[PDB]
Amino acid sequence: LLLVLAVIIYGTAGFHFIEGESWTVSLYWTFVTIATVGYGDYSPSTPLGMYFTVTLIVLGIATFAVAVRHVVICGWSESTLECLRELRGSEVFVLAEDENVRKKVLRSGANFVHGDPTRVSDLEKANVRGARAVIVDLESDSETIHCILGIRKIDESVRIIAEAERYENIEQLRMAGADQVISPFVISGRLMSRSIDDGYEAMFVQDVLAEESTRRMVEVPIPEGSKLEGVSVLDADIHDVTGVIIIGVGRGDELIIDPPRDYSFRAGDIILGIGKPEEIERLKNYISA
Amino acid sequence: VLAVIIYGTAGFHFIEGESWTVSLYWTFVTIATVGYGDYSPSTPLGMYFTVTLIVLGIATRHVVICGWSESTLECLRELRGSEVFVLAEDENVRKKVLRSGANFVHGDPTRVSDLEKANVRGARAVIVDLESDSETIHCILGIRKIDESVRIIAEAERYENIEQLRMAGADQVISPFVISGRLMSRSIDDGYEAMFVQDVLAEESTRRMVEVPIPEGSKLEGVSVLDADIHDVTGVIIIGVGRGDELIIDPPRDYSFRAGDIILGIGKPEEIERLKNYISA
Amino acid sequence: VLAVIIYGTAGFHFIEGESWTVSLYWTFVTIATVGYGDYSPSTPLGMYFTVTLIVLGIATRHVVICGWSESTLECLRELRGSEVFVLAEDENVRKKVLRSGANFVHGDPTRVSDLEKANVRGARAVIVDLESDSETIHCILGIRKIDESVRIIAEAERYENIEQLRMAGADQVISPFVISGRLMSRSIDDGYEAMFVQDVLAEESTRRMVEVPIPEGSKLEGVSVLDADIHDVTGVIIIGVGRGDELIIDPPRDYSFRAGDIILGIGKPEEIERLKNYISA
Amino acid sequence: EKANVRGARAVIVDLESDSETIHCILGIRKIDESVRIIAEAERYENIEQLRMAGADQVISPFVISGRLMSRSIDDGYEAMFVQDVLAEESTRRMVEVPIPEGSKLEGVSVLDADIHDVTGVIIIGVGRGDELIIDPPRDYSFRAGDIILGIGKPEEIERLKNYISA
Amino acid sequence: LLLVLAVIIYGTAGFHFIEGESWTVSLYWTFVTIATVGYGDYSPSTPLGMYFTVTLIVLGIATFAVAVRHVVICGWSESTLECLRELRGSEVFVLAEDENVRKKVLRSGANFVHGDPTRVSDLEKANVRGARAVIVDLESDSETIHCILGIRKIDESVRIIAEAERYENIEQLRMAGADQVISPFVISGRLMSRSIDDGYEAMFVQDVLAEESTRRMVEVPIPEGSKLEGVSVLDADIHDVTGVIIIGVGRGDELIIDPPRDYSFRAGDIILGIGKPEEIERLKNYISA
Ligand SMILES: [Ca+2]
Ligand SMILES: [Ca+2]
Ligand SMILES: [Ca+2]
Ligand SMILES: [Ca+2]
Ligand SMILES: [Ca+2]
Ligand SMILES: [Ca+2]
Ligand SMILES: [Ca+2]
Ligand SMILES: [Ca+2]
Ligand SMILES: [Ca+2]
Ligand SMILES: [Ca+2]
Ligand SMILES: [Ca+2]
Ligand SMILES: [Ca+2]
Ligand SMILES: [Ca+2]
Ligand SMILES: [Ca+2]
Ligand SMILES: [Ca+2]
């Protein structure tokens, strides 16, 4: 305020009478003397402004040297790192409290916001409010849950997907307002048991989720006025017809796995199938208006 | 930089045949990389020197808060607008304290040299919450050894050492886990105690809780607390009246208002006036 | 700085009526605080701009060592003179490694991306001592997944996992607490074993311990180790001879020198020659 | 004391930190001030302070290790030799054989004695007291009390023992 | 070596032909362009040296901005801090390994040497070799002892005064080469016991050592050819005569406390007495040749 404003009010005053120059001449030089620019279009011609040019080079050079749509990921874990790797190409904001993490998050194609996902001021700082969804994995299930309540107190209908570390608190996470709860040690622990005899379960689950498999696992919805509305799941012979396996069909926020042969396709239904990309089309078409 | 300025004004006096006001006036424009140009190396004897003087020249009242806790953070939030100095030993804290409108003094409130460093001596009061009651107490004795009558308000962590804090010279001892612990018990059945205590203290409640003093020669001196019908008269509830460094809560109907008495009442701000006036000379 | 240079060459083209080579040539002398002076603000329209462009302008083969331990520090001390790259994860270590004549690569030898970062792929050999035998082993598998035939020499901390280190792909496993632990036992009675082992390995001893190979078509091929009287002949003691990736210590008198054989002997440097010559084609 | 350092064949010391190792040493000296003390050094920097404190023999496994590391870049044999002579499995054992008073070999030349040929036992060095000469010159003169340091089959460690007696 | 030497070999080359100037003209300007000095006595007059003055302002300004007698105390403890407070006025070098300590040591009137008193290279770094004495208090008696052996391996006769933390290792410190071993918890622990009944012992010991007491505790030596040589300690009535109390007399590297009445004052003897400073003179004189 009045630091480099006192040496600029002292350098334009001692260059007005000490070198007989205008107010636009004393000031225009003081900015070239303190900025060590020194065009030269106004040098000390009188030893009265030369002892002043030396004093406005100390109090002047010193005072001018030091007076001069998206997806929010809360937490930075291997899980949420593995997720960021699959959102490459979308606007992602990682909010976490360790600063060092910043490099990894940047290199991993997402924006870093240093903050504490349980503090709301920081949720805000990452525009939780209005984001496609918020994905939460904090170090401890309590912190994860705390962060969730924070978000709810903001966009109280934003989509919240969270990871549960203990099974014991799967529901408290949902209670706190998590929309979808993923529990990787449960999934893992089970595939472990299952993989004692033969590997295929652990093989299927891990592979459908990896891009390399030709077969991709997709949700295809049943659009209003569908060639298939009220139609039987069996009457529709979808597998044969389109090749796409129907593993289940999502009526809302539930999913019926392997629906009975007599299932009736309401529109708005979500179809969950694995199949070659060529035949995910066939199903999309054999389904339209 | 006084050896390169004594070397640059010496090799610009004989090597370029200039005055003492000419060699020095240029050396400050050569080392400062300003370079007006009103004195450039015209002789290759001052040009090999202008290169050497470009390397060796260019290269060449208030309130003190001891401790920073959530309590003392919650206090700083209510002194916004007064000169406060927070003295604590963790440096990182400095940002939060600054953003919170108070001045930071990095130091160790138990070390006196640092109490000094924050002008404990002559401050309205010193407020102490250190991490451990022993440290709190230590800090207190420190202050006493300086302004031995400054007002000292301190927070006690254990109940067990409420008096040792007062012993050490704390004037007022606040114990938030006791207050909390009790409101807990009391809030089992119904919330109102905890509600009252927390709300009177929060600004939002229209009713504010104030101390009004009985000035010398008061329309109310020697007057009965009952004879004065203060509630009815002014609306201000009288919850207690402070005769000195004690406070009588809900004084008997026959209480006699000496002047200098402190009246402790809750009431709308409009009627805190009514009480102020109905009380004056 | 490309917006202030596009703003300073634009407000010095119309505000001082100069070319594009004139507005730009001055903006680089104004922002760089050089200020030759060959283009100063002559119009107060480019003088209020020279002040604004003074603020926004002035303001605007080798060997990889995985792990850094006293062992691998004692090794770097003996490779002084070769291209060495130390890869370790503590940054502070960087000074010691640099002063010790090797290049530092900050990284985590178990992470492959960092093995890469130090060009494990194609290095004379990789030497591994990580803090824990598991990490050591992990680092080894990393390397194999890259140059799967690079030479890997690793130090084992427990004996129990000497083979797991070899299993993981360590070519040569050195176990200094075993060597030490044994010399301990052996040095109870007399010092000489511990003396021998430590001294042959230290430069100061005139006698150096060298491997001399038996070149194809050797004056000594098919020749008996005894028939060759190598000690007497050359002075060089034959302590063992390495037939491939094994070493026979104190070969029987009737050992038959195939070429490609490695001779392991101690002897004065003058007579390491004598052996080299008495051995050639 | 509680472990009878006082009068023990030798005391062997490896404490967690070289300072503690050294301290332990001085303790022992303050008791049996001539008991044999063999100690391990963690830094090289304090090899001598350990000896200073009274360690008779100082073993430094990270130096031995660190060197074999360097040496094993090119070929494994040094590291192989050192580790194997020390392990029982190798038929060849590395032994010290002393030259008893009135030895068939006293004043005899190390070369004149053709010990290798004669007995098969390699002479890697000979310990004249508390020093060891490695690969002694051909003209070494076997005083009695000398310690012979050699590798060789157990059968021929005898041959050397006998070819050496009174 | 060849970084800012390639832009100075490039700026004196493109200012020789591009502005037709000498070798002393291209170089003399390049040092004023890269140093952002800019006298102006050689500005780009040709647009061929103006596109070069812009290129020698980037590769030139960037490459010239980042390419541009005594007493040793080993250890910094409250003890050795309390000692430094009493050597104010002598050349002291504190060698310790925590850097932060540096400020306290400086403010306390001694020079700081950051190092590890057990590493010899650092003992060296503080000129242990040839210092009046070396004073050692390291954090742990083992480290203290280690540091001592280090010093011995250097000036093997320098005076070494060290503090012992345990009593158990008082002698190992002396063994390692400590000349004088001070054990403050022993001194303290004893005065504790002694101060149960009455304070005077703890009072005497602490006060004789503090300046404020008029009475100072001094060692006065018996110079060769002393008015007092062979003289009896009793025959000399030193107390009465001079007022100075004789608490003991140091025959070499031992000290006899309260010598028998029949003690015979050899010269070179050290007299240890308390007394007013006026009468420490009287004793000095009543003692000379
Ligand atoms: Ca997790
Ligand atoms: Ca299975
Ligand atoms: Ca299919
Ligand atoms: Ca507290
Ligand atoms: Ca209640
Ligand atoms: Ca009211
Ligand atoms: Ca190791
Ligand atoms: Ca032995
Ligand atoms: Ca030889
Ligand atoms: Ca050890
Ligand atoms: Ca080799
Ligand atoms: Ca043999
Ligand atoms: Ca101490
Ligand atoms: Ca007493
Ligand atoms: Ca006296």
From Swiss-Prot, chains A, E:
Keyword set, alphabetical order: Calcium, Cell membrane, Ion channel, Ion transport, Membrane, Metal-binding, Potassium, Potassium transport, Transmembrane, Transmembrane helix, Transport
InterPro entries, per the entry: K_chnl_dom, NAD(P)-bd_dom_sf, RCK_C, RCK_C_sf, RCK_N, Trk_Ktr_HKT_K-transport
Top-level taxon: Archaea
Places the protein is found: Cell membrane
Every RCK C-terminal domain range: 205-289
Intramembrane-annotated stretches: 26-35, 36-41
Role summary: Calcium-gated potassium channel.
Record remark on domains: The channel is composed of 4 repeated units, each containing a transmembrane pore part and a gating ring part. The gating ring is composed of eight identical RCK (Regulators of K conductance) domains, in an alternating arrangement of one domain from each of the four subunits and four from the intracellular solution. Two protein interfaces between dimers of RCK domains from the pore-forming subunit and from the intracellular solution hold the ring together. One is called the fixed interface and the other the flexible interface. The flexible interface forms a cleft where calcium binds.
PANTHER family listed in its UniProt record: POTASSIUM CHANNEL PROTEIN 2-RELATED-RELATED, POTASSIUM CHANNEL PROTEIN YUGO-RELATED
Protein name in the entry: Calcium-gated potassium channel MthK
Taxonomic source organism: Methanothermobacter thermautotrophicus (strain ATCC 29096 / DSM 1053 / JCM 10044 / NBRC 100330 / Delta H)
Gene expressing this chain: mthK
